[PDB]
Design a binder for this molecule. Structure first.
Ligand SMILES: [Cl-]
Ligand SMILES: [Cl-]
Ligand SMILES: [Cl-]
Ligand SMILES: [Cl-]
Ligand SMILES: [Cl-]
Length: 124
């Protein structure tokens, strides 16, 4: 089984681009990070920052999670992100995503030793 930290990295990290690199970015990335294998993942955010910058957020501003948990952290600075959401024309096995680039604060849930991101909660 994949560790929680490894699943967070696979699903949410894309340090190799500064920003969503076209309207087809989400279709490409959702397949290659294997988020469309048995089912189209409906919603997913990619962060275009270093892994170290994202990991640093677990030491930034402690806020509530949407679920009421108390192990969420909001980035002090905005970060380049891309939101991917399935469109109405999406039907597995032909998944189809809208790509939305933005620069927002991120909110992540953290856990473990090392204390690292395990869940992407939200962006602001
Ligand atoms: Cl790991
Ligand atoms: Cl997400
Ligand atoms: Cl990097
Ligand atoms: Cl900022
Ligand atoms: Cl641990």
């Amino acid at each position: 089984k994949e560790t929680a930290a490894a699943k967070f990295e696979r699903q949410h990290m894309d340090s190799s681009t500064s920003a969503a690199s076209s309207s087809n970015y989400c279709n490409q990335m959702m397949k290659s990070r294997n988020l469309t294998k048995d089912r189209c993942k409906p919603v997913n955010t990619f962060v275009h920052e270093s892994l170290a910058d994202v990991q640093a957020v677990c030491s930034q501003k402690n806020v509530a999670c949407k679920n009421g948990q108390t192990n969420c952290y909001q980035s002090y600075s905005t970060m380049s992100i891309t939101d991917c959401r399935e469109t109405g024309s999406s039907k597995y096995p032909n998944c189809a995503y809208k790509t939305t680039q933005a620069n927002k604060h991120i909110i992540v849930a953290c856990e473990g030793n090392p204390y690292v991101p395990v869940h992407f909660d939200a962006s602001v």
